[PDB]
């Protein structure tokens, strides 16, 4: 629940446990797939949720599923970008973190369709981010100037970049 220097609160993390189950045990297979995540730090129970994800077994891409195996790093790196500057532990844009959960809920309803990589990919999943980002940029730069429109447009181009770990 804390957005620390290295984490940004997004949603249920169905994305994380895909490397060790689509490469080691069971792998690609037909049947409806179910995911359970019970996060816990030391001795504190913090949440519980579920996810019925779609899976038929149409092979796998190692690298793309490796990027999908941790989107939390990409989301935190997108959140930590400030409006202007280069300081490393500035909080960045805190209203980006307030639109990440709805965007995650909009992306994740066809989470297995995104998983199997048929027509859903990383490069077209962030297209839904644009609307909330336009209205957040309307809040952020409340000037009718050429410059403010330019910063709004540069704010729009923000999207989570994949990481190879």
């Amino acid at each position: 629940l804390m957005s620390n220097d290295r984490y940004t609160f997004a949603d249920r993390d169905w994305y994380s446990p895909l490397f060790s189950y689509l490469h080691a045990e069971g792998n690609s297979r037909q049947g409806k797939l179910w995911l359970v995540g019970f996060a816990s730090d030391k001795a504190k129970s913090i949440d519980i949720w579920d996810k019925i994800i779609e899976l038929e077994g149409t092979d796998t891409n190692d690298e793309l599923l490796a990027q999908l195996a941790n989107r939390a790093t990409a989301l935190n790196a997108m959140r930590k970008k400030p409006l202007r500057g280069d300081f490393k532990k500035s909080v960045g844009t805190p209203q980006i973190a307030d639109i990440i959960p709805h965007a995650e809920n909009r992306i994740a309803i066809n989470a297995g369709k995104m998983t199997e990589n048929r027509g859903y990919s990383w490069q077209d999943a962030d297209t839904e981010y644009g609307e909330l980002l336009t209205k957040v940029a309307y809040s952020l730069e409340p000037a009718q100037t050429v410059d403010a429109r330019l910063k709004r447009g540069n704010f729009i181009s923000r999207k989570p970049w994949p990481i190879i770990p």
Partner: protein, 165 residues
């Protein structure tokens, strides 16, 4: 509109002495000189009894003063954020482009009466770049409704559109 066109056409009919006394009244309200008020009344009264829509009085006075000072010609499709921006592409992006760009954005956060001097410097650099045409009707009906943010954002996005092309 079918009311502002007659006002601009009547302004183009004005002879040298009338716009000379309009030139002498820069930054001065239409009260401290009798001939200036008489000229404004002659220009401004008879267009309300022939067409139901007329510009605002302050917009008409400011536009008459600026027209006398600069003396452009009326041509459709030559609004301020097109010629502006077209001249911004003829610039070095390092130093001079932010200078002229800030000079343009100063207009977007000002009320009608105080824009005489920023519009003066904008039209001064327009005159330096040898610009003959200016859509006085288009400028007038985007200025009479300058207090609503949709037309300001449309004007700014017109500057963006002319800059990217």
């Amino acid at each position: 509109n079918r009311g502002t066109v007659d006002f601009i056409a009547s302004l183009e009919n004005l002879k040298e002495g009338d716009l000379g006394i309009l030139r002498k009244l820069r930054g001065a309200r239409l009260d401290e000189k009798l001939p200036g008020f008489d000229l404004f009344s002659a220009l401004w009264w008879p267009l309300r009894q022939k067409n139901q829509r007329a510009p605002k009085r302050e917009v008409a006075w400011l536009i008459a003063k600026l027209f006398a000072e600069f003396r452009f010609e009326q041509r459709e499709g030559a609004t301020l954020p097109i010629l502006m921006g077209g001249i911004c592409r003829k610039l070095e992006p390092k130093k001079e482009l932010p200078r002229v760009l800030a000079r343009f954005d100063q207009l977007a956060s000002l009320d009608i009466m105080q824009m005489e001097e920023p519009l003066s410097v904008i039209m001064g650099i327009l005159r330096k770049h040898q610009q003959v045409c200016l859509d006085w009707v288009g400028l007038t009906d985007v200025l009479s409704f300058w207090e609503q943010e949709p037309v300001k954002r449309e004007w700014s996005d017109s500057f963006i559109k002319a800059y990217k092309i």
